[PDB]
Symmetry: C2
Subunit: 193 residues, 2 copies
């Protein structure tokens, strides 16, 4: 059997490997395929989005600020009033399911952006090479803090979290294999807290 999963950016940058490697080990007969984009079929969606379709909130995901470890002027925590006086890297704001848009929804916040990339790993790579800052999930910053030489800081905003949801087509749940995968995906996702 083939399962088509959509794991949206940035969640795909840790969950895709975890899901793929696990299912590869315990069920080599099962073939899982992944897409990250939300343009429009697809058995399961893992995202920060609610589809109203069955949607299950899995956890509240803490967000943080990231910058290069080698930044010449950022070291310790920032004040809320100072967040948007830095230069920011973010993912494309205008697209559906944009990870970054909730933190740059006004003109003054958007003016701080110097780079809009396609995915959060592109954002992190640019941050690692520049003086730009970005807002990212804590698990993502920590996963790449050592390899990409990033420092992590608290996000001093009231909107410092995002809820991760597992979603599927309600009618499809009435199937043994669909239920097995649902259970598997809940376990793997919840390990992110």
């Amino acid at each position: 059997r083939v399962f088509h999963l959509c794991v949206c950016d940035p969640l795909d940058s840790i969950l895709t490997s975890q899901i793929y490697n696990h299912i590869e080990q315990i069920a080599p007969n099962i073939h899982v395929m992944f897409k990250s984009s939300l343009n429009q079929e697809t058995e399961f969606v893992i995202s920060y989005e609610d589809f109203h379709f069955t949607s299950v909130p899995l956890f509240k995901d803490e967000m943080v600020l990231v910058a290069s470890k080698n930044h010449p002027t950022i070291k310790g925590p920032l004040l809320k009033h100072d967040v948007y006086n830095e230069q920011h890297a973010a993912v494309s704001l205008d697209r559906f399911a944009s990870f970054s848009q909730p933190w740059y929804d006004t003109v003054d916040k958007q003016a701080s952006i110097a780079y809009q990339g396609m995915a959060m790993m592109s954002v992190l790579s640019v941050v690692s090479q520049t003086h730009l800052v970005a807002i990212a999930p804590r698990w993502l910053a920590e996963e790449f803090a050592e390899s990409l030489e990033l420092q992590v800081l608290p996000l001093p905003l009231k909107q410092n979290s995002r809820t991760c949801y597992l979603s599927w087509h309600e009618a499809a749940g009435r199937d043994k294999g669909h239920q097995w995968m649902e259970e598997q995906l809940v376990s793997i996702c919840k390990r992110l807290e």
Copy 2:
């Protein structure tokens, strides 16, 4: 003055920082802003695409195969016949200006894909965590070979290169500042060979 640049994926993962850092050093009065997406304004586009708009081919860009250094079964070069017997990570194939689509344009090639991500840095991150392979520019693989623990292999296909172009609106070139930026961007881009 403000310059809006579009540096398409994957070129943004090295050129965005190089352009931004350089212009930041030699002309702090100039403000450069970057987007990577090609949805549809924008003074300059750096991509593998020709717009017919002035387009200048800058260099032929050599492509390679990448895999995790820790892969259990990939070590040395592959045979052409073996390329699509691996499991592949790629960027979304169907979108305009998709980097990956030229290497997965048939059903048999597309069947090798297990992961379609939004950007090549997402692809590389998944490769680094799995047994998947991907096709990437040599400069990109080498930039992240050490940090993401990647091995590099020749791409044994006839289509082993892509041409990078700098493009702009012809009417806009009749301006001193536009010419200065054109000259700057040519120099920086050509350093990728």
